[PDB]
Amino acid sequence: ASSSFKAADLQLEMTQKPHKKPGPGEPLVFGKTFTDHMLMVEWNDKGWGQPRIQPFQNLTLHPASSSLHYSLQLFEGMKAFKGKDQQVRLFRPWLNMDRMLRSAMRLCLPSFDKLELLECIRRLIEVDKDWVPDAAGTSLYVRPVLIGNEPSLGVSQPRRALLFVILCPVGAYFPGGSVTPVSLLADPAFIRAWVGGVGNYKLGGNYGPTVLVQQEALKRGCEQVLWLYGPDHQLTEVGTMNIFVYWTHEDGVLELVTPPLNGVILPGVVRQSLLDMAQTWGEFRVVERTITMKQLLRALEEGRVREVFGSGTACQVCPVHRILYKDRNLHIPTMENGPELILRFQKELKEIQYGIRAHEWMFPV
Template sequence: MFGVTAAQCDWFNLELKPLLAHNMAGKSIPSFQAADLVFQLLSSSTRETTADVSTFGTCFTDHMLTIEWSVTEGWQPPLIKPFENLSLHPACSSLHYGIQLFEGLKAYRGDDNRLRIFRPMLNMQRMANSAKRACLPAFDQSELLECIRRLVEIEQDWVPHSNQGSLYIRPTFISTEPTLGLKTPTRALLYVILSPGRPYFANGGKDVSLWADPKYTRAWIGGTGDCKMGGNYGGSMFAQYEAVHYGCEQVLWLYGEDHKITEAGTMNIFLHWINEDGEEELSTPPLDGLILPGVTRQSILDITRKWDEFKVTERYLTMAQFCSALKQQRVKELFGSGTACMICPVGLILYQGENLHIPNQEKSSLLTTRLTKELEDIQYGRTASDWTLLV
């Protein structure tokens, strides 16, 4: 069950390791190695693979991956062990100063009963970028992915037998520096936990409503908006609370005096519309440091550019432009995208005291419907694609 096939070895050794074994300067990255994995597994009689997964992120599998690092000893061998609480020093700098980051990706059980992880190298690259920004140690991305693949393989019975379910993979990287002094970490812990579940939003696939108010800002130029760090999310909760107070489900994050549209809740955002020049266009904000480089975002751009049926751009749009297009009936769809939710249509925006209703076309003609099907066909193995890693 825990073996590696010849095809997987070829993929790992011939494709990933040559691509990622060096940093930008061309030097090897001191890293843990998947070949050094240590296993401390529960016996089959003590394992549990049935749980209530109705609420996202509340149920976890039997095992986790942990990898420790220190400046004096470097990376320790990766360990897959029973899921358990962490033991941290009370002065741990990840708790006091937010020196931490995380990732989110998914494994799917295909119609052929095989498990596939969707575009995991994009997550590894983003995690490495976040680690650099947080002054946490570098690692070989391909080695981490192989460790994750082995963990998912061990926990494969937890992957739902459902086209509505998946196994959410949460790599996390924290400083374990035991001091109140703010300094570059000399100790750190990288760990991975798994959570089976259903779609993130429990709204039955209905359109979400957004509250747009420029008094709150998710990210700013020169900040860490393009990194997947916990502070970006914890700092958004008060605005989310206010959105609910006004009867909306999520926040539409605006930036600058011209109220640029940036993200929606924890999602990237897309506008499908007829632009000022009369062209059909799919637009999303550019990756200039404010925007998280989402994997689903990139996949939507890749798919629609391959279609070559309409203009696809990465540019900012302001609320003034959006309101004008809405009044002139040039808006086709507005939707969010992300790993947890995948694609989520927006039905209403509350902006400056006015409810802006987004038009709904026939479901069969919606771009969101078409994109969802194409992505799910890849994720569940109905369409062959090099975007998935077989477990």
């Protein structure tokens, strides 16, 4: 009664202007197409209003809105998948709710009950169940967002906020049983986040500044940015992805490594999962630890590196075959080693996500 909105009070408003779905020919470029409905909940000094599913529509915002002046905004990104039996499922939606909540706190935005939001999302996706593609490799992208909405140029804790969710079908990222590597630009010139910063939260502010760097990565001939940090150029993340390395370490032990959640990297859901899986298999050392370019160069020379890749909801797993550093093109042997591990990861997630094998990680819609 001044804490959280409840799914039980959700309000439905089916559209009166259904939109033509992307014909079976239609491309489906990442975030360019949206479904018919959206979720919407308002918050002010009266607590949350009633959550409501409404037709997709513009946002009406006051010119002084803090979401626009002081970046009082955060968002989440997760996927729902439709299996061959056309049942739709989310991938560990809970971890996303957690993260959203944590970001919400960092920006002094109002908290809410994750189960209620999750259910509300489940109701929304349900409403647009038809928008979920089901061609192999495709999915529905779930975009929850929360922004401060005070019509005040004061940089204070907002007293008015707004949470909303939008959905878009996304097409396949790789052919059924393979993957294609990407080249990375690695330049100390740019930092993405720092210690004591806010990079371990998914806030809009973390991304705005990457657009320029991303272009520099392309003009320089690469496709993504490997973010280096500190004086030893430690690897943090690869653009909107957590970085992983499968190699024989200096101590001669075969292991899967990924930078620790110090506070400069984002707690990827896929990231978590890949560790979970690997720790399960028990076939090799799985460790969270700092990785430095130094260690990487030497591991490359002595040929101890097998696979390098990033994790993320866009493709789950993505191979790396080239890293441009100090104007030096480093060939990464990922494809030459299978990529054995990447494919397994890829294969296991697909069977879990598309409902080939039942699993606790999947939240049915």
